[PDB]
């Protein structure tokens, strides 16, 4: 049941990531990456496993995550795809650091 209470905290962490408090830098991660946008024609060639916040929420509701570490692996996969595809100086990379900082600070205080 320790795992069950951890997965409940994962939902609250993702809820804060969806909150308006962070919407100024968390919006590029709400929905899956729109590969039909200009300049993103080579995203599926660089990123082999896409991941977004809506997919993480869908798998939380479907209870696909066994433990909280599998949840964090997808959250960090979401940020790693941004670090790998986008050049470092881009603004979206800076937005990923701000949202990941919010995640890592909340994820570190997981009940144990």
């Amino acid at each position: 049941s320790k795992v069950s209470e951890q997965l409940k905290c994962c939902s609250g962490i993702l809820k804060e990531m969806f909150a308006k408090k962070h919407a100024a830098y968390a919006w590029p991660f709400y929905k899956p990456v729109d590969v039909e946008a200009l300049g993103l024609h080579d995203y599926c060639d660089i990123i082999k496993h896409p991941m977004d916040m809506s997919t993480i929420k869908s798998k939380l509701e479907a209870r696909e995550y066994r433990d909280a570490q599998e949840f964090g692996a997808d959250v960090r996969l979401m940020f790693s795809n941004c670090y790998k595809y986008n050049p470092p100086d881009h603004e979206v990379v800076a937005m990923a650091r701000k949202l990941q900082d919010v995640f890592e600070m909340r994820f570190a205080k997981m009940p144990d």
């Binding site: 590029p28 729109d34 300049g39 993103l40």
Partner: peptide
């Protein structure tokens, strides 16, 4: 103007 991940728009300031 601003462009992020193919999304281009004009801010309210400009």
């Amino acid at each position: 103007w601003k462009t992020i991940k193919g999304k281009t728009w004009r801010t309210k300031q400009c």
